[model samples]
Target: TMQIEQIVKKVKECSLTPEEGLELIKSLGKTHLYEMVWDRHEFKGSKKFPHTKEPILFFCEDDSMYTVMKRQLEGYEAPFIYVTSGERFEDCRNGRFTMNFTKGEDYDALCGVLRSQNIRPRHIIHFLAAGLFKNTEDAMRKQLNKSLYSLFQMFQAFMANKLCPKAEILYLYENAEGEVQPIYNAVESFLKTVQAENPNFTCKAAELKSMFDEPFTKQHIADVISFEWNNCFTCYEPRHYYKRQLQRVKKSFSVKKNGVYLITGGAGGLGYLFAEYLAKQAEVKLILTGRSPASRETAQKLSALENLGAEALYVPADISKEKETDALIKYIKQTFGELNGILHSAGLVKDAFIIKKTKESIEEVIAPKVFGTVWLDKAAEEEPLDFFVMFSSLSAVLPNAGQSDYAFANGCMDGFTQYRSMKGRPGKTLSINWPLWDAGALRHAGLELLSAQAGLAAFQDSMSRSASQLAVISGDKDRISELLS
Candidate 1:
């Protein structure tokens, strides 16, 4: 007779009831319904777009799982958002933010929940799945032919417990004659659950076996999908993953012509925008550094590359500091030999009653933007830089009351880039200070404050005059490449 526990267990974990599904739907309205959508799409309805790409790359602490996925999914872009426990930082659709876990955090399963990339990167989010369990090895490897998750679980389980005691063992077996068999339906449900949670996962739970099953453990082989992972790419929703009419290897992968680039503060706001634009260039290797990025979400972002040129390495570094900054320069110098160009686009802004600002708060404003650029400049000083483009905002020249910090930092940057162009690489510094873009923090704030066009224009015109002076400073500096000729 079947025991009660056994009977209850076999109850086919019935698909969520219609009412329960509806309840879940309603719950989404409250917490947030993040959509992982297509490359160029205006999603119908989404509460908060923390991560905005289809196949969102999930970042992580160690380079193992995420790195492996990085190697595997080199150019895939059809949505497959990998979730992770952010031991270092977290990537939300809003942008990459730090997580609660750390080197000292407990490795318990609960913390595992923290290891996920909820954001959708626009360019390089790629290669899904990055979590290792403490048990089950051969079972997983055999069950799905040879999936990374299986291989990883086996290794982690063995290392954490195996040999003589407790560790995750490969949950696989061979039936009747000599064919490998699956060990758990739990995986099926788990994959499906992930699919349900991430609107961008394109691989089907049921169809997963086809990709999993190798012709034979030894010699039997079927088809091979040279899954190319994209660099910190992202998607809007399931359409980018399942419904988007885009082909990965054929169309998107051809964009990059093979060059190496560096993106400082690659996880922040304006910097992210720059990345969104740069990805349109050919398949260039992207060396993205973020002060706060070390989660499964960050790791998975390696797969979201729109094209094949932008492969990436997400190193954790604070561009404001010398040691970290030098490391970045060394990394690029040693790895890519000569950088195609350097795009310095990092800044900090504080919008409080200027009179009520604290010294620490004022310093905070300059740290990310001012210090960040200085650090990178020092690093790229020795390299053969193609272009040292610094994003000098209009605010840098035209002072704003609430943006005292921005004005100072950007003003300094414009000066630095101009001076450096004459000295560093005998190159030209493009000090392009764009006016109120129809987007971002500046736009958001402008929309709320400046009502009539004249009101907006007044502030802008004030900025334009100052910017013009700075532009003169930029070109006239004899130390920078002589622009006068």
Candidate 2:
């Protein structure tokens, strides 16, 4: 296995030729999908356009049938992973017509169902409908109900068969209604209808149980021979897998000159890296600050930032202070006139046993980290600063044993982002929380206490300028995280 750190570093260092890129993909295979998806789909709560595409896989064995199905997926949100082609299933083969879906077109239709019904099932059903068949929402409503258990059952019965499954039926509507229980009314309704129409209907005990059994429920059968078995992550389709490629289609923006980046915690590790990156940029200007370390080193470090295509000005005050925060905003207002990005990597640390943790320790961490977030959030609101980036940690959700300060501060950061996204930021903001980097106070303390990567945050970025700047910024001392990733 290539260490991810090494793989990331090498990928960044050498551009892969088309052949080499193919080789890398082949070598990576399924594992690459996991990492990239893990990066984009961490929080299952929101649909803030993790800016990813999803995929729907097919396993049609028949040639004509498979090609016909593939045609419907053009311009869809995600890609298709086809493993088999041509003939339908032996179980379902020798069938006249097979059904397939158009990803984007179908999804739009599905979202209409949700909106029309005003059901808040997902923020990204339209995103999902792009890969699934167009009638997915209709099918979802038909197959699943309000019960969580029924929901799982829905995927089983609804998706396991071709649109015309001879075996997997139990009356769609009656099965949908329940008052504590449908009391087999759906079954009775189905039987009566079948008897009335065909006069050759028999109730089978085995088929009823089989409807929810492994073959039907455990996997997603796209079509006759074409089934969708979930990847390890339990995703119905490979949405995360598809997203990694969209990012590749267009590279992320690079740190630029004359761009005004209002960064909080300009005094600390990740924050400092952001500052240095902008300062060194032959073109950006910076507004940076810290409470304790007010010095010429900070100023000299930030000096050329103004004239260097970009420039910097450092103020020594706690961002929690309205006056100090306002001062920083005023400088950015006059200096750059408009802002490009804001990095709120400023954080204060307090380490105490949970039982022994003081209010002061908690406040110390929350003030700069939390209220620092608040003040800067308002500051950016004042500046109308979009592209706002912040420092966050894994501990926000997955908290550690002792560091309540660090843990909760990050936790608030996550909540704030969710709130901002749903409500709309005063300006466009991309709050990128810097994950645990190698050579920082957090890393040093982590080695001293928890495991090395204990502090990793999927919402975070790297330590080098490439993290935010894409190799355009350089630290005075090169870092191992930089060298490795």
Candidate 3:
């Protein structure tokens, strides 16, 4: 009484022999594997400008691009304030001001100066550049601080001053063409949530390549800035955008028998779910890791996986640390000789409104998702990994208030997947932007269960396809549309 679809599933799950599978396939006729790829598409340009005559603030670090930007903006009609970081606050002179973004008191001082001058900015531009880093803890932290944490502080300061309601937030960075950047997508999603709450507010981002590489004229800078202000998103290199499109391809998720797999945050809810699925799919070794020490309860959970025909072990380490991740991979290599796959599900969530968040709080939420991914990727650089899976959240693309840190952290993972793919890394990289699951304490029962199921399916589909990033959301279609719109 076995159905044809059931036989196909059995073959895919490796429950049937090759001869049996081939017979079933012959009877069912030919089929092709399909994968999703991002196809570039053109978009219409806009020339709309801000309606207000208020001053525009440009926040930039001491960099060459900043110098060019400042020179170009000097000739503009609208008043501009050039704000830069310094050791201490300095009085504004000739339209230049200095403040330390990391210091809360500095933001307070800046706000007082703005009030004293009767200047309410209609546009605030962030010119922070994203940098590439080597495999070092200091370099990783520095990159996060420069690219993400600093921006979070500035946005929080703006929120505390109530300057975000009807204002425009703009970010300019170097173009990593054909690859997703964390800050770019983070700002896009943050603005989407902001726009949902405030209709008149707008946020735009642009990636400029000319300033960094080739010689650029003042007109080019002006034109690029104008195009950014006029449009929601723009990339100067090409007037095109990428959209996910389905294409037929010959690829599938192949789990190796008796292979060793690592799951970061293995004691967590989602990690356990994935471990159970992997155990049922194949008889393999599963190493689960987390910051917490092994416990009686956790041992019982591992026992359950063993009962399902997996050799499971519990390892305790904060994977965000470079040395610890290196040790983990070394142990795997010594004991098992190879790591077949990885599931990076470890993360921390400290939800607080942007205005209420502290520097320490922001770093705590970002370290696991951002630093852990980088360290793991570096540590396992030599491993012959079949797949490198990261557990991202819908927050990366559709975040709400109090989730700025989480959103940016997840956005970094999304970017890392694309980075790995572009660099021709040793594995099939997939970052699943998952919806709310029913297993955690925040579960909402039925709907959450349905959504979690959809997320699981999306994960399989992404691994079986070519798309590196996929957002799995399940809810009322209209509300989803509105939030994404």
Candidate 4:
């Protein structure tokens, strides 16, 4: 077996054959295949705050989980004001409130009610769950509304009312035992971004055992709540802390000549670059899809791919819509007879602080990444695809102040990739969480070389491993640590 250092030397010297080079890349990928393992930690003393007279607000869906939470919190000294979407619960007390988050008037009315009572909650907990949807597109919008957008509404209202910045906001969701919940993952990333932006405002997300799981009784709920309240962290996924570990593995992936590939957002910067790389690697056929209609300029770009000895076509369609995606896939099958691979890079960014964001803006940013991925995945279910690659972003991991929506969308893609791999999907599923790319710079220029090399390595590595998520970030190490911390 060649040592990794020896492979690296050969690669730098340009002395390896194509097969040897590919083996080197695969071995490097195996070395970098990080597995997320949950480790348990023990805390010595309790960190729960002493009982106080400050009120606590609970915003929840009308579900059994809400009932469990209400029952558990009833014993606390903090006066609880339960807010639900519909009519007040049958057991509602004087402190309980009713408001529809989807309705502005209802939100205002709830605010008015709180103001009249001279109440400012010291803690606000959102117990919103991603509800089931019959349609994938509906799930994309509805789940975000249930789990994230409503939380956004609460924060906006809190800011409007000039609530105490020191107050803590907690989001509670049911965990999937050993799996990742895509929407909740997005919600967690959103909360972290919120915490980073507002230093005084503590935001956290807790994942409790599902109610359907055995041993998740009333006592368990109470204990979990107490534990979360006592701990001060951005995320409290019970019983586990994740650590990324690299393990050795054997796998191989390669692009085939005459393979028909689809690139969503193919007209965009990174997408076009990836298309060019693929065409250079193999004489493949490229099908490019963008929301915009084909133009003279796009035609010239496609012709450039053709000039590189690859057949290229540009299709205009909103990949987020099921009908449009279905049509696009059907056309490819009819034209090429077989769809071979996919590089999903379709996304839009509408940057705004959580408080400043509107529902329309949030949906607009999420639709392309979340809904588009879902539609494309569904539409390509029958295709014998060699790989399914999603172009995610570093914002999903260390989001800046104005990238909450973008982070949430990319986070969903990350989780979705994991889900696909877990289910043993036909194609190799991979989500590359990429950093900002300097498109104008030469590929071999300093950091650009690192970025391009990492990107290609990840792409090559995806074909050989079961791990679905990889972060390809470059820049100042101190800045990365600062943002992560």
Local distance difference test, each candidate: 0.40, 0.38, 0.69, 0.71
Clashes of each: 107, 30, 0, 0
Ranking by TM-score: 4, 3, 2, 1
Full ranking by lDDT: 4, 3, 1, 2
Q: Positional deviation of 308 in candidate 3, in angstroms?
A: 1.4
Q: Model 1 reaches what TM-score against the true structure?
A: 0.38
**RMSD to truth, every model:** 30.4, 21.2, 6.0, 5.4
**Angstrom error at residue 250, model 4:** 14
Superposed Cα deviation of residue 233, candidate 4 (Å): 7.5
Itemize residue pairs with steric clashes in candidate 4: none
lDDT of 2 by residue, 380-439 (tens): 565555466656654432234455446545644543554455446654444343333543
Q: Give me the overall lDDT of model 4.
A: 0.71
Model 1 scores a C-alpha lDDT of 0.40
Error at 411, model 3, angstroms: 0.9
77: Cα error in model 3, Å: 5.0
- lDDT: worst 10-residue window of model 3: 441-450
